Nucleic acid binder design. Sequence first.
DNA 1: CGATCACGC
DNA 2: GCGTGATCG
Length: 581
Amino acid sequence: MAKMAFTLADRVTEEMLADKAALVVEVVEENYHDAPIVGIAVVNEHGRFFLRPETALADPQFVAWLGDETKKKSMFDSKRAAVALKWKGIELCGVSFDLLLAAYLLDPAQGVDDVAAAAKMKQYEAVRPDEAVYGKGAKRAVPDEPVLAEHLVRKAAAIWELERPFLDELRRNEQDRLLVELEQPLSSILAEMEFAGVKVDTKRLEQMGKELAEQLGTVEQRIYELAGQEFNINSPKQLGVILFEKLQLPVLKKTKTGYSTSADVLEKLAPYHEIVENILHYRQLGKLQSTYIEGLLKVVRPDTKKVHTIFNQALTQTGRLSSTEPNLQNIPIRLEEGRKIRQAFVPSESDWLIFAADYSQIELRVLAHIAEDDNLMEAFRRDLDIHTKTAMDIFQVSEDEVTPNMRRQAKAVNFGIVYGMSDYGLAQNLNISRKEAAEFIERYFESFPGVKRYMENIVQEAKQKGYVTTLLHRRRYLPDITSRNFNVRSFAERMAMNTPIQGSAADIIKKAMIDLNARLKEERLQAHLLLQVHDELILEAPKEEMERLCRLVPEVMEQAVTLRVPLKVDYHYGSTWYDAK
DNA sequence: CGATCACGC
DNA sequence: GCGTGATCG
């Protein structure tokens, strides 16, 4: 009666197939793609059951219950179960409550990664953290059946008990529809995207691998010639001894252990010595090689030549997705050498093409909407180039008098407003003075007084309410907004300024993903989502569908919500992700 | 591990 | 502002 009672079941019975249940389909491998299911727990009105998966998943009655939309299941991290079951050809339906997503909407700062941490939010402690049962990292093991089954039954019993109070609190926060109509349906869409995966041209990556390895070997040798000795170019310390001690280059910035060797600093040092540009080029090549070529080839499935990312839907403090193993949300684009990596991401079938649609300036259009700044809203109703226009306003010039440097500076100020940075932050970002950065910000606020009002009002609202919200009622708690430490307080103020913009942008693209999946099914298109990259959706479709996607994808993305400004989506397609430009 | 740096939006 | 991850020591 400190132990939890359950049937360790040999076969599946009708009692286990009630039309409401807490279900655990446990996948212990962090990467759940084609991973084993180690055990199953069901808690329902009839009691508590553990089933061995070779039993339950081979039983036609259990499989049909899993697939029955009208048999409602409460889970934690239903996507993990959904995907592991997809790899076994088994459909999971009727998941009406996901505790991971419920806890994430109530408070993203909790970092709820297991049932125990979700349960601790409601004073429920009759369940162990996964880490205590499985261990961590290397020592990490499925334990023997009696320990495993008791753990899964306790997770299920916790889920069974916590559904009601999580749903009550979401309802009080007006997040009930954010759970049921946004995050849960998106969960199933991410499952499909992860499972379908993205085809890679591994031969192209291998060949890029070879060219890079030769170029690195060249640039390595040059570096040791200019330094007149061998060292580890990747040692943050050994590089600092070569640059600042042997060659005696000026120290323009320190960090902690010693000297900054960031690309910011190295660029300023290039004139002093021919070693610096070689070091910068070497780092560029080395990044492509380590992170992108070798990293990608490590996780490609040799049988299909696909990568299967995992979108973490319950991690970011703003409501964005993250992407792991591999991260397909940070593939190079800015420098042409890196951008060529995208030539290796190809359609998964013959005569298919990659279709990429991205929102134009979604953060600043969202800012124009929430601030109701008359001038910024007008700028977007004219579809002006927003950086050119901010330049005309802050420097008091006509369009024709805006220089490339003015535009670059106006662009950085636009980012500085969205990130809520201080004079210091903008000065650091622009390599200018603080008094200067403050004149820019003051002039911006004179051109956009509604944005100034919004920035002041949202800091005061975070202080008064304890949190800030997005368009679709996502929340972030900011307790540090009342700290008497200036740096901790200022960081909370920037989050109060930024989170509604970045979070509202995340809300809109998630709704567009839901609306777009429904429209593709209605339209009988084979086109499907592969990736989301924050303000961008990537699909693949038969070439015969491109003409329809050119009208449908932007339309659905533009109409996902109605703001006081239009939403604008650009779109391109081609043979590879690279060519979808 | 955590500090640093480099990639994305 | 928000992320992942390769690397060193």
